[PDB]
Ligand binder design. Structure first.
Ligand SMILES: Cc1sc(-c2ccccn2)c(C2=CCC(C)(C)CC2)c1[C@H](OC(C)(C)C)C(=O)O
Ligand SMILES: Cc1sc(-c2ccccn2)c(C2=CCC(C)(C)CC2)c1[C@H](OC(C)(C)C)C(=O)O
Ligand SMILES: [Mg+2]
Ligand SMILES: [Mg+2]
Ligand SMILES: [Mg+2]
Ligand SMILES: [Mg+2]
Lengths: 131, 131
């Protein structure tokens, strides 16, 4: 189902990586954030919601969604309540970049454009079909 | 044509807002950045390219694309070489949020979800059709 996303943080090199997965397609978005915080999660969701039709969000750590900032974002945006494979791609391109955040975006790109249709194509097809 | 984007910075409240427009649909993405820098532009393009099939980019200030970091991102990602309407929506929601960056994302959301099909639907349709 096309409005469902998964959202979790992983850790790498002492930093936090917020990873959203469009469950039906396997498409990902990710950002490196300073701290694993309710506020950062909220802002992330705002950005995600303006880009895709986000209806429901799941997580492996329910306590992530407990902050008032997060609930307020989900309220405003109308939302209701890979990390190993990505680390793999991060590892493969890590040395081409100085900043971890740059390596993460390189990795997100590679993940979304690979065929094994790519995740990037499937999200768009699934969502266009739903219109 | 579906792989064409426009990219420019505007200024608001002493900060820089990077605005990308998918020309065929009018869909936007935007971020608040510390400084109008080649490096920030590069990183922005990396993120944009992993999310959408970006083929060519235009700007109103050609000197934006002059930094080696920018050319290197366009090289890696395979890329070749609204601000008033968005400010309008920013103005309308500005008071609901503390941080400008939050108001910008609120505004991007409102811009992409409005019908006047929304920009958000058209990008996806145009791109799915192209697959
Ligand atoms: C901090 C820097 S400098 C720099 C670069 C690369 C070539 C020429 C000049 N600058 C790069 C690049 C490395 C990877 C890419 C794909 C080639 C994009 C540009 C970076 C890159 O940081 C950015 C993306 C914030 C600029 C990095 O983390 O290494
Ligand atoms: C710095 C803060 S705190 C906060 C908030 C709002 C309600 C309850 C608790 N926190 C908010 C919110 C205001 C707008 C939204 C749509 C309701 C999302 C959450 C903000 C918001 O910053 C965030 C998005 C980085 C957290 C802001 O700039 O005001
Ligand atoms: Mg988690
Ligand atoms: Mg909170
Ligand atoms: Mg400009
Ligand atoms: Mg440079």
């Amino acid at each position: 189902s096309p409005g469902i996303w998964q959202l979790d943080c992983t850790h790498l090199e002492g930093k936090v990586i917020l990873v959203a997965v469009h469950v039906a397609s396997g498409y990902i978005e990710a950002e490196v954030i300073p701290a694993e915080t309710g506020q950062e999660t909220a802002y992330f969701l705002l950005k995600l919601a303006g880009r895709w039709p986000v209806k429901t969000v799941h997580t492996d750590n329910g306590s992530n969604f407990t902050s008032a900032a997060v609930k307020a974002a989900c309220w405003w945006a109308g939302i209701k309540q890979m990390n190993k494979e990505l680390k793999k791609i991060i590892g493969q391109v890590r040395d081409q970049a100085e900043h971890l955040k740059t390596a993460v975006q390189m990795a997100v790109f590679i993940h979304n454009k690979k065929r094994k249709y790519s995740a990037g194509e499937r999200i768009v097809d699934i969502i266009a079909t739903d219109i």
